[PDB]
Amino acid sequence: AATADVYDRLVDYAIAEWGECPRPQMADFVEQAWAARGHRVRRVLELCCGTGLMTEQLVRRGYEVTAVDRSETMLALAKQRVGGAADFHQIELPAPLPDGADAVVCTAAAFNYQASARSLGETLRAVATVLPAGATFVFDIETAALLKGHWGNRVWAADEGDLAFIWDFTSEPDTTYCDVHYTQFTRHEAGADAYTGVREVHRLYAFDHDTVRAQARAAGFAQAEVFDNYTERPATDTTRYETWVLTRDERSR
Amino acid sequence: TADVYDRLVDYAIAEWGECPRPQMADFVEQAWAARGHRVRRVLELCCGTGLMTEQLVRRGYEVTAVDRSETMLALAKQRVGGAADFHQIELPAPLPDGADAVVCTAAAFNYQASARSLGETLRAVATVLPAGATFVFDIETAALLKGHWGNRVWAADEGDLAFIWDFTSEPDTTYCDVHYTQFTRHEAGADAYTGVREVHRLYAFDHDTVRAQARAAGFAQAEVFDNYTERPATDTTRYETWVLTRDER
Ligand SMILES: [K+]
After folding, report:
1. What is the distance in angstroms between the Cα of B195 and the nearest Cα belonging to chain A?
2. Contact A201/B at CB under 8 A
3. Are the beta carbons of B155 and A166 separated by less than 8 Å?
4. Cα separation of B98 and A137, whole Å?
5. Of B151, B157, B195, the CB nearest to A166
6. Does the keyword field hold Secreted (chain A) (predicted)?
7. A185 Cβ under 8 Å from any chain B Cβ
8. Within its chain, how far is the Cα of B122 from the centroid?
9. A93 in a labelled binding site
């Protein structure tokens, strides 16, 4: 199976070659966003924690983290990296979320897995249900220009000893989604170079600003600010990763 | 096996800008027709699986193909058949004489580190070339090794064939390293892949080095082109095509 070290080196490659934001900078921007808007944040809910790179940052910085993810195998890599300092649960969005969080975060472009705009709105509604008025929800999504391949084709691979992995991001010109073709080779026995191949395919969807703003406004986030990859500069046509900062409306409005 | 090597060449052509083999022979024929020396017998070094050998044979040349690997010669002798004389030679080593020209496409001169190693190969070719004959070969440039490849990864999963090109490059160097991994499936057709690996360092050579060794080897004239076209080589050239002309001595 793909260890946490291989996933980390995939993130390192996305930072160097694909313009992805390093995880310490994500947590820095997220902490600074909370303080700059007058938010006393102690408890944080993290949607789709993955292997726990963002979870590890939030725990080192002294937050009471609750991390959820649909994949049980990804949670095992997250509990090993962080430990018992964070609460881990298995939740596939959209689904009812736990209460008690001062802020909600969802990094690593996990929201691109939402199959449709309705599913995106249903997930945003589940977040607004557990957020008090004024609390923030910060997430990032890859843009259509990135998913279409305007900055080149994204592909990476790692040749470990008994394991080998290939991530091929393909984009058809007639669709608005990107298909991630994941290939895994596993050495049968220690000596012979015979391998077993396993292939999985996942789909990443794009959402324009009108859809994100309409679904967020319908879920109870009338205020939606979009930034360029965890910085203070605005989102432009050259933006590959958009950082959205939503603020929960007043329930009396 | 021959289909595996052909699909690897297809990837290099499509993804890295390598010249298709029919267009290589077009440039080679066009160059030969403008040097004032009748070319009929062609000594092809580094023939590999016979992709360039097939083009020279199809165009009516008497080809003598050689390669350092025996498994590569069997695939080349299977593709072309018997219309070429195949031999196993690993330069620097004595080469056969009697050819009107020498060609070596997709050359492995980037595996060589020192300029002396480049000079030994050029001297071996000049020994079996008469006055005025030409030596045509290609070389990968720093713009390809450092600029394009660099520290990027190229890989593909084509079902029965999967491969990985993992490049490593430092800014203070004139070379790059590549880690190659390959998985192939044959008669099983289900889930039985054979994995093989190889690692090579790829060196870059400046034009002054190539010409200095060429003049010392017996090639007074050394012309460089951009990837088997008549356009000259620039800073964006990824594959230089060199045309060396043997001295009158
Ligand atoms: K690399």
Report:
1. 5
2. no
3. yes
4. 78
5. B157
6. no
7. yes
8. 14
9. yes
Distance A154 CA to ligand 1 centre (A): 13
Nearest by CB: B157 against A159, A181, A194: A181
CATH tag for A149-205 (out of 2.20.25.110, 3.50.30.50, 3.30.230.10, 3.50.50.60): 2.20.25.110
Strands of the sheet with A223-228, listed across from one edge: A87-90, A64-69, A43-46, A103-106, A136-142, A241-247, A223-228
C-alpha of residue B144 to centroid of ligand 1, in Å: 14
Is B193 among the annotated ligand-binding positions? no
| Region B144-203: CATH code | 2.20.25.110
2.30.110.20, 3.40.50.150, 3.90.79.10, 3.40.50.360: CATH of B2-141+206-246: 3.40.50.150
Does the bond joining A94 to the residue before it have cis omega, within 30 degrees of 0?
A: yes
Instruction: Kindly report the number of other CB atoms within 10 A of residue A70's CB atom.
Output: 15
The shortest CB-CB distance from B195 to any of A17, A168, A195 is to A195
Q: CA-to-CA distance for B244 and B249, rounded, in angstroms?
A: 15
- Name the amino acid, one letter, at A49: C
- Would the CB atoms of A187 and B195 count as touching at under 8 Å? yes
Method used for this model? X-ray
Residue A2 Cα to ligand 1 middle (Å): 18
Query: Does residue B237 contact residue B126 with C-beta atoms inside 8 Å?
Result: no
3-state secondary structure of A134: coil
CA A205 – CA A115 distance, rounded (Å) = 7
